Amino acid sequence: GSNQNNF
Numbered sequence: 001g002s003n004q005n006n007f
């Protein structure tokens with residue numbers, strides 16, 4: 001799957 005981190 002794809003992963004996104006938005007700090």
Ligand SMILES: [Zn+2]
Nearest residue numbers: 001002003004
């Ligand atoms: Zn993955």
